[PDB]
Structure 1
Amino acid sequence: MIREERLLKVLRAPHVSEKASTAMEKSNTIVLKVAKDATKAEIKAAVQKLFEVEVEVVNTLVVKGKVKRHGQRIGRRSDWKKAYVTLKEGQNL
């Protein structure tokens, strides 16, 4: 049992993009920004508990942050974790 307090911290935001929208309307898969240290099992439990939908499978990847310039200053955005969450057929989010 993953504690609800942990489940409430692992989902960070929906991910909005053309690929995400196509995933939702073609494969019943929603795309999320998730905490960097979240596992697939944690993501699955959090989606099921908080969004109240049944999940088929979770795929994950780590996005490396870009180096950016700002007023001659060089910086680097943080890496983050993206989750493609496939829902069971018939579920709607």
Structure 2
Amino acid sequence: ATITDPRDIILAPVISEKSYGLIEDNVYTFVVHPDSNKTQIKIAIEKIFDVKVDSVNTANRQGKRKRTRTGFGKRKSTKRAIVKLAAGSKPIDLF
């Protein structure tokens, strides 16, 4: 029996200078499952954090290709979701 939880779509947050700059504007970036869509991510975030989500922005990034002694290797490709919270705006401290 499959039990679908909203917490498997969201994999991990994104930590970087750009992500922090978005955070000071109440905008958070997550690494989501590559087979998810904007509405699914919005619903999952609303269920997880009990927050009102205004908009979700997605972008696909190709993993970097690295040279090794064995040859060429490619890292995993990932999808990023940039979630903007509503005016209620209680910060996500789990970040």
Q: Shorter-chain TM-score: which interval?
A: 0.7 to 0.9
Displacement of 1:71 in angstroms is 2.7
**1:19 matches 2:18:** yes
Which runs of 5 or more residues in structure 1 are unaligned?
A: none
CA offsets 1:36-81 (integer angstroms, 9 cap, x no match):
0110011101111112221110000001111012334311112110
TM-score (norm 1): 0.87
State the SS of the aligned residue for 1:83. Answer: strand
Identity %: 34
Could you tell me the TM-score, scaled by structure 2's length? 0.85
* Contact 1:55 1:86 (8 Å CA) reproduced: yes
Amino acid at match of 2:48: L
Q: Could you say which residue in structure 2 is the equivalent of 1:62?
A: 60
Q: How far, CA to CA, are the matches of 1:52 and 1:37 in structure 2?
A: 23
Higher helix share: 1
Structure 2 stretches lacking a partner, 5+ long: none
Alignment of 1:22-37 (within 5 A): 22-25=21-24, 27-37=25-35
**Which residue matches 2:50?**
52
Report how many residues are paired: 89
